[PDB]
């Protein structure tokens, strides 16, 4: 329980999830071409959200 | 949110109506804590510049404490006026619209039947 | 003559499509020069010639500078134009086709919205003073010297500051 | 720091205060070759400020009371121990080399500050442009390792191009057997315990890298010993030198002002010498670092800022 | 950098946001934003190395594109209503593109991809002036039109801002990137409270500014751009580690530090407006922000990292670097929690 | 599509299982297209074929998660004869998490997705029963 | 006028699409920015001419001045980029990621 | 937190200056003459020009 | 404005050309000068919230004065109904709508 499974369940799994999430969110290439294409996707999504909210 | 109220002059620290408020007593825990913050600022400054902690810069510590007390006093007067005018507008709207704030009749603990939840 | 402004606006949209499609910046500057010429024509159509003539002259000097910079440093051995690449020409003709389709949809489905075939040429000049002196567009720009002195000083300070900005950047 | 942008506006123009003898002249030679007396006589008879070779205790002599402190405060490196056993496992050789480079950098900053503040020229002995020679001598003799060489090159890259090169570099060409004879005649037994291979590596480092890279950017004055050991003809050459190259020509008042700010704030001077590259030759650790630091603050005259230590006679502490 | 250019550039940097805040004209707000950008470009390129060149180029194209989207919104509003202000009945599309452009000007996620890149490669004082001064005028414009903006778009922008700010600050080691992601999370909080109470947005902006200013000053003390570089501060300047710890804990927002006060009052007003889910998610991502803050504190203050030999010579030398405003801002950003009714309005 | 996700809730749970599965699959597919577009834009593939393959993989994975979640929620509601019970949504969220773990080929992600998506779906059901506002208009 | 304004809105929309979709040339990006500027100028001028707002006629000249200052600063940054890397290719400016 | 897609990263420089490969200077070569009024007909002056 | 230096010092750096019905050069009124004037005097002193509900009549007049959406739709139907009648031939244009009129000054 204590040295294996409660540690595997709550704290180490939370740390693993947040480490994987920060790796995926900051695995960036540093290319502003990709950054501006992402900005275009953001603009398109905001237009879509406004159009469906009306 | 109070910036659109009627009779709102733009950009003055203390309007004339604020002079109708009782001023701070000048020996109260807020201004005493402001002076203590100024003294701690002076001690922090001395320790960071590697001077003696209180044996150096007595004039600097005095200026820090006095400026902190001064700014705290005037800011405290401003917030006292702001809270006073907030309560004044609140009570004015409450008096102006009594049909939205009815004096509800609360019954006593002989007409109200609270449910009983036994612990056993 | 009624759809003259519509033809000009379609040509301006085509020039902006080529500019967005991005050929070599020689051809990009050429497309934006003809877009500035078309925009000058539209301003002259809608009213006072001062604004259109001024933006034409300003972009003539501006893209003089842009062409000089492009032939200096924004060049490669084999410049890329609209038709040298199959993909770029494909999106060019696709954009033209999609523009035609979009104006057809706004003509048919939406009826009198932003585009109307029968109402074209009827709502270009809304109201004009039939008898009157000092109605041209240059009078307001002159009144910037008199009515909007804040606008005059912020434009002048922008140019002065920008001179200092460029000197500091290209100081090297 | 009294000098600043306000002082520059009110007028402290370096080009206004310069003259014909406001030069940085560095004398360089082998380990024992006529270098100390030559620079001293040049400075004496041309009216420049003489700066001897920045040793281990240079920072200790230029800061505080100026007495040489204990070695654990002043670097924990010994030239005598390097001469006795250069390949020791404590890493004394590269520790001494890096400490001497830091001392030379502080001396260069001090000399540049003196030149840009007073206008009087400086005559340095073996400045920072001639310390990679000792680097490469240690490396080719196997005394240090490639990680030490790369770390020194990194610090040299971070600290070198922010300063100006010397106006004149004077070189003394003395052969290796003559260096042997002069070292034997000096009488220091640690200095006798050196190798002709090490001195030949020093001379090779001179002739292959130091002389041309300053030849392309300043005035080079390779002189023999007999042209030397007579510090008057070299002075006539310095007088009739023409400086028509190097980056000193393109400098103006504001570039001098920013360089003066950089060389007067010593923390930015020695900022990049304390990079956190964890090389075991230089790194110390928490316990030893804290013990040495606490002993240094308990040292007399070093507990507070200079001017605030009541034990050394500072007065009006409560009013400043 | 001669004093004439210094005075002109610094006066234009000051004048930009002042014009933007003082102008009742949306166009004059736009031209104030133009002054701010065009004036801060040379201060970014001032080091003249490739990293600052990339940073200045990325900053220029990002703020230029955002400025043109602002100008589109202003011109469309002028076409629709005939005035130069989003008064009450401007189009929601115009308001949303205004929000998009001002958010990408501010640097909040998912428009935040440039901000760590821009603040990296520039000097620390330029990062300070960027992250403090450039974020007042866009927030002023957003404050001017608070009842008209879209609560759902603002709230989703706030959530993604705090999420990617917390994750980025968790990942990076560099000080400037860490403060960039901290800034992204703090703008997430300010936008989260913006549609409901702009006074709380101003309070959070002031608290964040007085929190991030002396942290940047402490970074300027030794030009420490690395976790290790700020870790050997115990040998460099030991009399500052307590203030570093207290300011980083206040940045994390624990009681009784006064940096808990903005998050506390923000979630109080948010729950007054019944968005408890939104407040809870924001608070847990603030806990992640505090996690990377606590890792920084562990690195620099509570443990003593190994030091090198030349730090002895650095301790031999003396410095007059920390100015008069460092201790004042540090104390007012550390121990001002009992003055909470005075700090709020 | 606002009418589409409103017509998700026009019928109580345990009724129109095919309809609820189809709308939930469509919503998961939309979210997968968004995520795939973000992934392709930020981290570009080596080729357009690899990019469209990644878009297809992401869209199919998210559509599978949504389909399994909606299907298992509706089946659990039908079997247990009570629609307004968040345990059905917890079972559906666990099924979606196991679908995610099966697509990613890792039991750790399977269990993680089970717990997190079950909690999220249970909170969603509680909020839709008791009128929680996710993006409330400012009222005070 | 509404068809003209819709065409101008579409011209700005495609110019913004080109601005947001980089190609190999930073000068091509700057030219897309200038197309956005021209689109906005033409909108403001035709709106002022339609509404007869001579009080708002200084607005197009002001956007011309400020956007030309933007163009000047962009050309200065582009000459810095070309001096550093030989060309203005936007894929060269990617070393700030780490 | 190094991974497969970010293990190729290097730490940033301490002074924010990156060493790049020295690009070859493309000074243009002009064949001034021989068919030129200023070359006096028979001079092939090849010119290495910067600008 | 976020800050009110212009209101405090009494200056009008940019407050005098905020709308069409403001000051114009040489007393040449903009389009819908009276309709915007009716909207501004309605909405003053009641706040932004009460302006959207109680000044809807003046704003609706001002909006389609400036945009003419109802004018175009009304005018399009007349041209559409007339053009439909020309196919069936049960309508003819008058001489004064066909270019053959008696002009007047
Ligand atoms: C030596 C030090 C003292 C020198 C005093 C010299 C001057 C003097 O004699 O003044 C007399 C003066 C006479 O006061 P009074 O007009 O008779 O009214 C006093 C009543 O008790 C009326 O006072 P009250 O009890 O009604 O207090 C009013 C109110 C408003 O007062 C305040 O806000 C002041 C709070 C001060 C603490 O206080 C509070 O709301 C208390 C909030 C407590 C929780 C705050 C949570 C944050 C953490 C703790 C505070 C921050 C410490 C530093 C950070 C580290 C935290 C671990 O007494 C004081 O000013 C009392 C406070 C003095 C000590 C201040 C703290 C040290
Ligand atoms: C006037 C006569 C023009 C054509 C003269 C001629 O000899 O055409 C040969 C041409 C056949 O080409 P070729 O002589 O076999 O190939 C060598 C040419 O140099 C190959 O031609 P190039 O190297 O000059 O490149 C042609 C390129 C570039 O040339 C142009 O753009 C010319 C038109 C400028 C107006 O044009 C295109 O790729 C197609 C452009 C289509 C119109 C632009 C539509 C989008 C932009 C809208 C604004 C345009 C401003 O037909
Ligand atoms: C008393 C508490 C407040 C003290 C503030 C000043 C602190 C300071 O300067 O400490 C140094 C100084 C002692 O220095 P020193 O030993 O003389 O020589 C300096 C060393 O050579 C310097 O050696 P070094 O620089 O070479 O290396 C030392 C360095 C090496 O660095 C380290 O070792 C790093 C340590 C890292 C771990 C600690 C991180 C920070 C933790 C902060 C506290 C957190 C927990 C508390 C709860 C949350 C608080 C937000 O630093 C330290 O070891 C610690 C330095 C700071 C210690 C004092 C911290 C004070 C603030 C925190 C405690 C008080 C507030 C919270 C609690 C409130 C009550 C519940 O402390 C004092 O002098 C304390 C003040 C004593 C006189 C008070 C007189 C009051 C008079 C009142 C009447 C007159 C004014 C009337 C005004 C109103 C008129 C109307
Ligand atoms: C909400 C409003 C109403 C709905 C609106 C429409 C739908 C909106 C959906 C929003 C949530 C999803 C957002 C996804 C963003 C991109 C994630 C991604 O894949 O990044 C990878 C990409 C790098 O890809 P890579 O380098 O190839 O990595 C390889 C993988 O590690 C290789 O890993 P792998 O092989 O396992 O790949 C399989 C792939 C397959 O999965 C996907 O492709 C996406 C799956 C999404 C599942 C979660 C949503 C499920 C919803 C079910 C609803 C059921 C019905 C309702 C009842 C229950 C309600 C609870 O999974 C992933 O890639 C997972 C990525 C991490 C996702 C973390 C999501 C956390 C929040 C979840 C709840 C929301 O990272 C980035 O691009 C980083 C920057 C992302 C910035 C995003 C900023 C916006 C996010 C929110 C947008 C909200 C709407 C627009 C608002 C206005 C914005 C301006
Ligand atoms: C029976 C009851 C059941 C119900 C209750 C369950 C919850 C109980 C309470 C939760 C306890 C969580 C404990 C979290 C901390 C422990 C993990 C940890 O210490 O991770 C350390 C690790 C960093 O270690 P590092 O220093 O890099 O390397 C090791 C040696 N150098 O760290 C990492 O790698 C990353 C750490 C990330 C931060 C963790 C703490 C913040 C978590 C925020 C959660 C947000 C939840 C909402 C998320 C969005 C919606 C899904
Ligand atoms: C040195 C400080 C000198 C201060 C001089 C007076 C400044 C002044 O006029 O302040 C008034 C200012 C604006 O007052 P108000 O009309 O309410 O504006 C809306 C703001 N929410 O009031 C405010 O901005 C209120 C908050 C002031 C905070 C000051 C300390 C930070
Ligand atoms: C009921 C529990 C279902 C759990 C599904 C799951 O996520 O399983 C994880 C597992 C990982 O797959 P792996 O370990 O690579 O090997 C299986 C290859 N058939 O994946 C599988 O086992 C997937 C098997 C197919 C789907 C089964 C449901
Ligand atoms: C709103 C909705 C938000 C949903 C947010 C979550 C989305 C689904 C989960 C995504 C997880 C991504 C990271 C991951 O895969 O974590 C699984 C982790 C590591 O698994 P591993 O074998 O290392 O696989 C390679 C990494 N994928 O595997 C583990 O850590 C194993 C943990 C097993 C026990 C987990 C028990 C539940 C823990 C949380 C309890 C909360 C109360
Ligand atoms: N290992 C090492 N030793 C150095 C370095 N710089 C100087 N030394 C040593 C060499 C000598 O033993 C000692 C003194 O050097 P000098 O060249 O000044 O010799 P000295 O003053 O005895 O004679 P001289 O100046 O030649 O007339 O310092 C260095 O960077 N590394
Ligand atoms: Mg000597």
UniProtKB/TrEMBL annotation, chain F:
Q: Which GO terms describe its biological process?
A: mitochondrial electron transport, NADH to ubiquinone
Keyword Aminoacyl-tRNA synthetase assigned to the entry: answer is no
* InterPro entries xrefs: NDUFA11
Give the membrane topology, semicolon-separated if more than one: Multi-pass membrane protein
For this protein, the record's Pfam families field holds: Tim17 (PF02466)
Q: Which cysteines are joined by disulfide bonds?
A: 17-74, 94-114
Q: Name one GO cellular component term.
A: respiratory chain complex I
User: Which keywords accompany this UniProt record?
Assistant: Membrane, Mitochondrion, Mitochondrion inner membrane, Transmembrane, Transmembrane helix
**UniProt KW Glycosyltransferase keyword:** no
Localization of this protein: Mitochondrion inner membrane
- Similarity annotation: Belongs to the complex I NDUFA11 subunit family.
Q: How does it assemble?
A: Complex I is composed of 45 different subunits.
Q: Could you tell me what this protein does?
A: Accessory subunit of the mitochondrial membrane respiratory chain NADH dehydrogenase (Complex I), that is believed not to be involved in catalysis. Complex I functions in the transfer of electrons from NADH to the respiratory chain. The immediate electron acceptor for the enzyme is believed to be ubiquinone.
The name this protein goes by in its record: NADH dehydrogenase [ubiquinone] 1 alpha subcomplex subunit 11
Q: Which gene encodes it?
A: Ndufa11
């Amino acid at each position: 329980l204590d040295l294996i499974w409660l540690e595997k369940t709550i704290p180490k799994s939370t740390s693993t999830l947040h480490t994987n999430m920060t790796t995926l969110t900051t695995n960036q290439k540093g290319l502003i071409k990709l950054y501006f294409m992402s900005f275009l996707i953001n603009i398109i999504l905001i237009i879509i959200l406004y159009s469906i909210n009306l | 949110m109070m910036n659109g109220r009627p009779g709102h002059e733009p950009l003055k620290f203390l309007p004339d109506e604020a002079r109708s408020l009782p001023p701070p007593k000048l020996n109260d825990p807020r201004l005493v804590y402001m002076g203590l913050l100024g003294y701690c600022t002076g001690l922090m400054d001395n320790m960071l510049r590697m001077r003696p902690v209180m044996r150096a810069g007595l004039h600097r510590q005095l200026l820090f404490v006095t400026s902190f007390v001064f700014a705290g006093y005037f800011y405290l007067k401003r917030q006292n006026y702001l809270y006073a005018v907030k309560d004044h507008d609140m009570f004015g709207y409450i008096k102006l619209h009594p049909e939205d704030f009815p004096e509800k009749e609360k019954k006593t603990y002989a007409e109200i039947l609270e449910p009983f939840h036994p612990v056993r | 003559m009624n759809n003259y402004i519509f033809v000009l606006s379609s040509l301006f949209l085509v020039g902006c499509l080529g500019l967005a499609l991005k050929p070599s910046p020689i051809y990009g500057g050429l497309g934006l020069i003809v877009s500035g010429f078309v925009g000058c024509l539209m301003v002259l159509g809608f009213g006072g010639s001062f604004l259109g003539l001024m933006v034409f002259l300003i972009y003539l000097g501006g893209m003089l500078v842009v062409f000089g910079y492009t032939t200096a440093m924004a060049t490669e051995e084999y410049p890329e134009t609209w038709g040298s690449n199959w993909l770029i020409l494909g999106f060019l003709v696709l954009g033209v086709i999609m523009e035609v389709f979009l104006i057809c949809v706004l003509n048919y489905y939406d009826e009198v919205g932003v585009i109307n075939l029968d109402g074209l040429g009827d709502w270009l000049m809304y109201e004009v003073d039939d008898v009157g002196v000092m109605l041209e567009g240059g009078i307001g720009v002159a009144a910037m010297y008199s009515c909007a002195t804040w606008m005059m000083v912020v434009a002048g300070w922008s140019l002065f500051a920008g001179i200092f900005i460029i000197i500091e950047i290209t100081r090297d | 720091l009294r000098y600043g942008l306000l002082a520059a506006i009110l007028g402290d123009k370096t080009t206004k205060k310069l003259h014909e003898y406001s030069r940085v002249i560095t004398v360089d030679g082998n380990i024992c070759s006529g270098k100390n007396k030559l620079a001293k006589e040049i400075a004496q008879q041309l009216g420049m400020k003489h700066y001897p070779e920045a040793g281990i205790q240079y920072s200790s002599t230029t800061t505080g009371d100026g007495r040489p402190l204990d070695i654990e405060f002043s670097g924990s490196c010994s030239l005598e121990k390097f001469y006795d056993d250069p390949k020791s496992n404590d890493g004394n050789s590269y520790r001494l080399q890096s400490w001497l480079y830091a001392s030379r950098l502080l001396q260069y900053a001090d000399a540049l500050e003196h030149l840009l503040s007073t206008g009087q020229g400086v005559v340095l002995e073996r400045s920072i442009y001639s310390d990679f020679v000792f680097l490469e001598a240690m490396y080719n003799q196997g005394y240090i390792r490639k990680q030490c060489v790369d770390h020194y090159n990194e610090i040299k890259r971070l600290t070198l191009p922010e300063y100006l090169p010397p106006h004149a570099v004077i070189y003394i060409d003395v052969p290796v057997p003559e260096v042997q004879s002069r070292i034997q005649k000096k009488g220091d037994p640690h200095e006798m315990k050196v190798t002709s291979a090490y001195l030949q590596d020093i001379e090779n480092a001179y002739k292959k890298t130091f002389l041309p890279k300053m030849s392309e950017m300043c005035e080079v004055l390779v002189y023999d010993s007999w042209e030397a050991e007579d510090p008057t003809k070299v002075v006539e050459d310095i007088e009739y030198l023409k400086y028509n190259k190097g980056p000193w020509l393109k400098q103006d008042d504001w570039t001098f002002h920013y360089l003066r700010m950089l060389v007067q704030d010593k923390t930015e001077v020695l900022n990049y010498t304390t990079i956190p590259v964890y090389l075991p030759e230089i790194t110390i650790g928490a316990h030893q670092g804290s013990r040495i630091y606490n002993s240094f603050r308990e040292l007399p005259g070093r507990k507070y800022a200079p001017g605030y230590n009541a034990e050394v006679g500072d007065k009006w502490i409560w009013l400043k | 950098m001669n004093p004439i250019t210094l005075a002109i550039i610094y006066f234009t940097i000051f004048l930009g946001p002042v014009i933007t805040m003082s102008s009742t004209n949306l166009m004059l707000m736009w031209v104030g934003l133009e002054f701010s950008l065009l004036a801060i470009i040379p201060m970014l390129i001032n080091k003249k190395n490739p990293r600052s060149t990339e940073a200045a180029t990325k900053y220029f194209v990002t703020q230029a594109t955002a400025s043109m989207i602002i100008l589109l919104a202003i011109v469309l509003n002028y076409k629709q209503l005939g005035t130069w202000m989003f008064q009450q009945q401007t189009n929601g599309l115009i308001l949303n593109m205004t929000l998009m452009a001002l958010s990408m000007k501010l640097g909040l996620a998912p428009f935040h991809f440039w901000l760590p890149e821009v603040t990296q490669g520039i000097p620390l004082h330029m990062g300070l002036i960027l992250l403090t001064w450039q974020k007042i005028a866009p927030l002023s414009i957003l404050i001017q039109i608070y009842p008209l903006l879209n609560s759902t778009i603002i709230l989703m922008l706030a959530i993604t801002s705090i999420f990617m700010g917390a994750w980025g600050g968790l990942n990076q080691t560099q000080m400037r990137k860490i403060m960039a992601y901290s800034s992204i999370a703090h703008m997430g909080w300010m936008l989260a409270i913006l549609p409901y109470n702009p006074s709380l947005t101003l309070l959070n902006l002031m608290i964040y500014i007085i929190l991030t200013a002396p942290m940047f000053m402490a970074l300027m003390l030794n030009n420490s751009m690395t976790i290790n570089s700020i870790s050997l501060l115990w040998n460099k300047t030991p009399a500052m580690l307590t203030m570093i710890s207290l300011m980083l804990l206040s940045l994390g927002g624990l009681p009784p530090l006064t940096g808990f006060l903005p998050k506390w009052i923000i979630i109080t007003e948010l729950m007054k407006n019944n968005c408890l889910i939104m407040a809870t998610l924001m608070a847990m991502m603030a806990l992640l922000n505090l996690f990377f803050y606590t890792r920084l504190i562990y690195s620099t203050s509570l443990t003593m990292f190994p030091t090198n030999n030349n730090s002895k010579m650095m301790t031999h030398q003396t410095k007059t670097k920390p100015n008069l405003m460092f201790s004042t801002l540090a104390i007012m950003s550390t121990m001002t929690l009992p003055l909470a009714p005075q700090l709020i309005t | 599509v606002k009418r589409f996700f409103e017509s998700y809730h026009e019928v109580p749970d345990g009724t129109q299982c095919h309809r609820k599965t189809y709308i939930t699959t469509a919503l998961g597919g939309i979210c997968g297209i968004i995520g795939s577009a973000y992934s392709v834009s930020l981290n570009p593939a080596d080729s357009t074929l690899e990019a469209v393959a990644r878009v297809g993989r992401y869209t199919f994975t998210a559509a599978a998660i949504g389909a399994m979640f909606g299907l298992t929620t509706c089946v659990s509601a039908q079997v247990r004869e009570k629609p307004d019970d968040p345990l059905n949504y917890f079972i559906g969220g666990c099924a979606g998490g196991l679908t995610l773990g099966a697509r990613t080929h890792s039991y750790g992600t399977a269990a993680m997705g089970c717990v997190y998506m079950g909690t999220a779906a249970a909170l969603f059901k509680i909020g839709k029963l008791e009128g929680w506002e996710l993006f409330p208009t400012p009222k005070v | 006028m509404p068809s003209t304004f819709f065409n101008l809105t579409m011209a700005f929309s495609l110019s913004l699409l080109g601005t947001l979709m980089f190609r190999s040339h930073l000068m091509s990006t700057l030219l897309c920015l200038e197309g956005m500027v021209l689109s906005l100028f033409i909108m403001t001028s035709v709106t002022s001419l339609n509404s007869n707002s001579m009080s708002s006629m200084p607005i197009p000249i002001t956007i011309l001045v400020f956007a030309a200052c933007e163009a000047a600063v962009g050309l200065a940054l582009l000459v810095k980029v070309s001096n550093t890397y030989g060309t203005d290719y936007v894929q060269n400016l990617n070393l700030l990621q780490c | 937190y190094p991974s497969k897609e970010t293990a190729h990263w290097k730490p940033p420089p301490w002074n924010d200056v990156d060493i790049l490969k020295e690009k070859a200077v493309t000074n243009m070569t002009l064949n001034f003459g021989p068919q030129h009024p200023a070359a006096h007909g028979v001079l092939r002056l090849v010119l290495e020009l910067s600008g | 404005p976020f800050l009110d230096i212009q209101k405090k010092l009494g200056i009008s750096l940019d407050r005098h050309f905020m709308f069409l019905s403001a000051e114009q050069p040489y007393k040449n009124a903009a389009r819908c000068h009276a309709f915007e004037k009716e909207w501004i005097e309605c909405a003053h002193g009641i706040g932004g919230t009460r302006a959207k509900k109680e000044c809807k009549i003046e704003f609706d007049d001002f909006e389609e004065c400036l945009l003419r959406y109802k004018t175009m739709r009304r005018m399009h139907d007349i041209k559409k109904q007339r053009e439909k009648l020309m196919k069936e031939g049960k309508y003819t244009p008058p001489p004064h709508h066909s270019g053959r009129e008696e002009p007047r000054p």
